[PDB]
Amino acid sequence: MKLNKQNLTQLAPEVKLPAYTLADTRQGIAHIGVGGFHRAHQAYYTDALMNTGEGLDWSICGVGLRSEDRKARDDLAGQDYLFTLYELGDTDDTEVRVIGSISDMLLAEDSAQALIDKLASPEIRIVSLTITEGGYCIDDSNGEFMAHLPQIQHDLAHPSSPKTVFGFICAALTQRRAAGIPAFTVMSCDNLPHNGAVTRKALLAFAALHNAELHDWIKAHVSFPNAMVDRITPMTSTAHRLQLHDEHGIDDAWPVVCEPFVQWVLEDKFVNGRPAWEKVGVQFTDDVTPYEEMKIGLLNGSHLALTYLGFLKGYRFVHETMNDPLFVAYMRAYMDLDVTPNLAPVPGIDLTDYKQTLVDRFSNQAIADQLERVCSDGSSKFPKFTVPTINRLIADGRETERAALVVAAWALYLKGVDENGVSYTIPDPRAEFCQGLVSDDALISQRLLAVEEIFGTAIPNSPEFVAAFERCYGSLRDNGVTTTLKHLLKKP
Numbered sequence: 001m002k003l004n005k006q007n008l009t010q011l012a013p014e015v016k017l018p019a020y021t022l023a024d025t026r027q028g029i030a031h032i033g034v035g036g037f038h039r040a041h042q043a044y045y046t047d048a049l050m051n052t053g054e055g056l057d058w059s060i061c062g063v064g065l066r067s068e069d070r071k072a073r074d075d076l077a078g079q080d081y082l083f084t085l086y087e088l089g090d091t092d093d094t095e096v097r098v099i100g101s102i103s104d105m106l107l108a109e110d111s112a113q114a115l116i117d118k119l120a121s122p123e124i125r126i127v128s129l130t131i132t133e134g135g136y137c138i139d140d141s142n143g144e145f146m147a148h149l150p151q152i153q154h155d156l157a158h159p160s161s162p163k164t165v166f167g168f169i170c171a172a173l174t175q176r177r178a179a180g181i182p183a184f185t186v187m188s189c190d191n192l193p194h195n196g197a198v199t200r201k202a203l204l205a206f207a208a209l210h211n212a213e214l215h216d217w218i219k220a221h222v223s224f225p226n227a228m229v230d231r232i233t234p235m236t237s238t239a240h241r242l243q244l245h246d247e248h249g250i251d252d253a254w255p256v257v258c259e260p261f262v263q264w265v266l267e268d269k270f271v272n273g274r275p276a277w278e279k280v281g282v283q284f285t286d287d288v289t290p291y292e293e294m295k296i297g298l299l300n301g302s303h304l305a306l307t308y309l310g311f312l313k314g315y316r317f318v319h320e321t322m323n324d325p326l327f328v329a330y331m332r333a334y335m336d337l338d339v340t341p342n343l344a345p346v347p348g349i350d351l352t353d354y355k356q357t358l359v360d361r362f363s364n365q366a367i368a369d370q371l372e373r374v375c376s377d378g379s380s381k382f383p384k385f386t387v388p389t390i391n392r393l394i395a396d397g398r399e400t401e402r403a404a405l406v407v408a409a410w411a412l413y414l415k416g417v418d419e420n421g422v423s424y425t426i427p428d429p430r431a432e433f434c435q436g437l438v439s440d441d442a443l444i445s446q447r448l449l450a451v452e453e454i455f456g457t458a459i460p461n462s463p464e465f466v467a468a469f470e471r472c473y474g475s476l477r478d479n480g481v482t483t484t485l486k487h488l489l490k491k492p
């Protein structure tokens with residue numbers, strides 16, 4: 001049965017449906033970057049709220065800034081913007097549900113002015129973001145905005161025909177301001193420590209490139225709440241689409257698969273209101289930092305620790321790494337010895353229990369999360385997920401070898417051949433550049449570790465870290481992943 005408004009009431013009985021009248025909803029959120037995570041997290045909670053009969057004026061208008069986004073728009077439009085959220089997990093606590101909280105989706109390429117007009121509409125009160133970990137154009141080492149990027153210079157030169165996220169937000173804010181319409185909140189839903197502060201730094205820096213007056217008005221009228229967001233969401237696959245049809249009878253052109261667990265912790269800093277998400281499990285706090293350091297350092301950090309070694313070993317799913325005891329032991333040693341000592345207490349959460357739940361969640365066999373997905377964009381992920389932990393170990397004079405192995409694994413992985421002799425390409429926005437850094441084994445540590453916007457300055461200047469990196473890399477190249485882990489694990 002094709003999913004659409006006509007067949008909504010004709011689906012299998014186990015399929016959960018929106019409880020609200022789809023036609024009564026109105027838009028309040030414009031979301032930039034309509035991918036799997038947005039649909040399985042923000043759209044999911046917004047749909048849940050609407051099912052309680054509240055927040056019907058907070059429907060989401062998706063926004064696609066890239067040509068690849070046309071396919072999402074077409075697929076959703078062909079189903080009256082409905083899509084299936086398909087939970088997969090090793091227990092029965094999984095549900096299949098049709099989500100109705102996204103009511104439209106605009107593509108910048110169809111008309112920049114139509115998109116600016118949507119973003120400047122008074123009913124749109126929050127502009128949310130999933131533009132990836134490296135989408136903010138802020139150098140972690142020195143905190144500066146990359147003003148010299150081509151697309152950034154283009155937007156400064158043609159402010160009414162922007163291409164970038166900051167260009168569209170600025171154009172919309174100036175148009176609202178000219179019409180006497182209040183600003184919206186900009187709500188980052190990407191995985192970065194202090195993601196709201198980063199969003200603010202970037203937008204303000206870009207605004208200052210226009211003038212101080214605009215930079216100052218945005219600083220005083222727009223809020224940028226920080227948040228921790230969590231829900232494992234694999235890439236779309238034909239197998240999952242066929243499984244949804246086989247098991248629940250729905251023909252969905254683009255369902256979103258995700259794990260049952262979901263979490264959202266947010267600072268309540270909204271200038272123009274927000275849905276009452278707290279009624280459906282979203283947690284507001286006065287300080288999200290402990291939550292963000294906990295989740296990014298342990299979950300996202302462990303994902304990088306497993307993914308490159310896993311890919312080299314020939315594994316292709318996260319659960320496969322979890323079926324290898326050496327990988328589980330390595331992950332636990334990384335979490336227990338390297339990350340945990342750096343964490344401040346997190347209200348309402350026991351870290352020992354939490355670490356165990358990460359092992360359980362990564363061990364989900366039914367979800368089939370692709371190592372290609374977790375591996376992707378390491379150039380942007382390392383400074384967010386792993387380097388902060390390494391810097392602390394270096395400053396403390398603590399053992400860096402487990403953390404260095406993650407970087408050594410990435411370096412060998414960049415050569416593009418796994419242990420089964422299979423050649424693969426690198427899904428990274430800076431693939432060519434990174435691959436060139438590892439072309440000469442004799443110069444790898446000197447060249448790879450010297451990229452400041454990825455590794456910072458403590459790493460290349462630490463003889464202890466450099467030594468750990470070099471021996472890990474040599475060991476992986478010569479003895480392979482398994483033996484390297486065996487040796488590392490028999491280490492106090």
Ligand SMILES: NC(=O)c1ccc[n+]([C@@H]2O[C@H](COP(=O)([O-])OP(=O)(O)OC[C@H]3O[C@@H](n4cnc5c(N)ncnc54)[C@H](O)[C@@H]3O)[C@@H](O)[C@H]2O)c1
Binds near residue numbers: 066230
């Ligand atoms: N996938 C997960 O399990 C998960 C979990 C937590 C947080 N996230 C966060 O959300 C992001 C998206 O993951 P996903 O699963 O939706 O991925 P996806 O590949 O399904 O979609 C990524 C979306 O971001 C857009 N995008 C990419 N670069 C952009 C840029 N520079 N400017 C504007 N839009 C851009 C894409 O066009 C697309 O809309 C992550 O990068 C991360 O920060 C993902």
Ligand SMILES: OC[C@@H](O)[C@@H](O)[C@H](O)[C@H](O)CO
Binds near residue numbers: 300374
């Ligand atoms: O909530 C878990 C997500 O942050 C995680 O699946 C990331 O998308 C992953 O670590 C990216 O490599």
